[model samples]
Target chain A: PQITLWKRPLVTIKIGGQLKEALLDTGADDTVLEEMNLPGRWKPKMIGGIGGFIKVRQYDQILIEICGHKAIGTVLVGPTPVNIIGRNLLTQIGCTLNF
Target chain B: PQITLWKRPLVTIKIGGQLKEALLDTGADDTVLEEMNLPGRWKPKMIGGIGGFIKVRQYDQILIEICGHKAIGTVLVGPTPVNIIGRNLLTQIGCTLNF
Candidate 1:
């Protein structure tokens, strides 16, 4: 019998009819997508942190695939240049990461 | 050319193999998809606001089409029973809302 270690898999998301790879990070609490590639509708609303509440909004959602499984997830809308995959999905599938 | 009035369009989102209608608002900064209809894997994280930062997570994201155009975006993950369409996209297209 062989034990399968939960290896974090590379994820892909569809944007503008194109597929792109995403970075996997189990440390993050949610799955976050970059705003640069999203559509125009997603906006920001006031979000409060240690500083206080600020209006933050969303831009769009995407269809994504991981480990041969597919699902839809949300993206963060921002002008900042960054994209990442979080532990949101891994936790659900009872997956663990190795890095 | 006629001065086109940006009539807020009804948006449609696909979740669990079904399509649902969404309200459009140009005042919002981003597009938001509802978690109720979204697929699994999405989770929440902390968001900063006036009241203070609170932890939140997204449950899923959705595939949405508006006025025959489709794009990907993000969703806020929370237990609150509310879904909304914001202004992120509207601004880019130079749209306005009624009511």
Candidate 2:
């Protein structure tokens, strides 16, 4: 499957059996979603962004579905202004930058 | 040609006869580069990000070369922590999110 670049390449994604729209952020190192419920033991970590750093809970081995493609990876739940799908999950879905 | 998604998909680009590395940010709406001298008239604009917004000078019809591919588009200059190549320029280079 292929996704064309838009002003903002946002897509529907399913995490923890709940659906949400997240930005496909190739610049982000890890996927960060607005606070959500997940069954796991998580560790607290900080991530830096355009403006500053944010505190997040890193949850591992979570099920993530993007455009009908299913992948199990780490998902960070935090107070993010926007939900972001980073390279970790993108690679699982075989995402590539093609011209 | 294909470019793999890295934690941060940073690539070298040529702008205003100078070379610099920029993040391939699909999450950003406009291309923002660190303050540079550009030959053209510009307008003042503001762009928001993960945390806050910044004032920028928007230059139009600028020639940018990304990974050897030539494109002429809008480029924003400001006090950005990192150089970002957004969808506006990405689309010009025929970039797609492929799986």
Candidate 3:
């Protein structure tokens, strides 16, 4: 699918049996989501942006489904305006930017 | 050009005759840059992301050049880890997300 940039590239995604919408964020190096409870353990870490940074829980090897394909990578649970799928997982799904 | 997710999609942009590198951030709704003075009266504004919201100066009709293309839009000046080219301008450049 080719997604135009006229609007926010918000798409439906599935994680841990939950359906949610996330932005495909090319600017972000890691995937970050709103506060959520996922199984297994996570390590304390921090992610920053234009405003500043925040401490987050990093869950590794998490499975996520986008559109219809499934991919696994590190998922960060943090306080974000919306769920963001970054380059880490985007690469796994073979997503690319074109003009 | 097709940009892969293997690395950060940073590109050189020209603003006010100065060249700078920025990220093509589809997750961001507005374009934001590091603190720099522009010639125009601007309104104070706020933008948010995963971390938090920060106050920014919004300068409308700012001329920016990306990859030899001219685009005019509102540009936010504030502190950021890296400059971000958001949907507002990316749309002007005919950029899109592909899989």
Top candidate when judged by lDDT against the true structure: 3
A92 Cα displacement, candidate 2 (Å): 1.1
Candidate 1, residue B15: Cα displacement in angstroms equals 46
| Candidate 1 C-alpha lDDT tens digits along A28-96 | 334554444544576565432222333435544455565445545554543222244444443433343
Q: List fnat per candidate, in order.
A: 0.12, 0.77, 0.91
CAPRI rating of model 1: incorrect
DockQ of candidate 2 is: 0.71
Q: Which has the better lDDT: candidate 2, or candidate 3? A: 3
**Model 1 stretches with alpha carbons more than 4 Å out:** A1-11, A37-41, A45-61, A79-81, A92-94, B1-99
Of 1 and 2, the candidate ranking higher by TM-score: 2
lDDT by residue for model 3 over B1-99, one digit each (tens)? 888989999889999779999998998889999899888799999888766788899999988898877788999998777889999999988899998
The TM-scores of all predictions, comma-separated, are 0.33, 0.91, 0.96
Looking at model 3, residue A70 earns an lDDT score of 86
List, residue by residue over A1-99, the lDDT tens digit for candidate 3. 999988889899999899999999999899999998899989999988766789999999999999987889999998887899999999998899998
Candidate 2's C-alpha runs over 4 A off are none
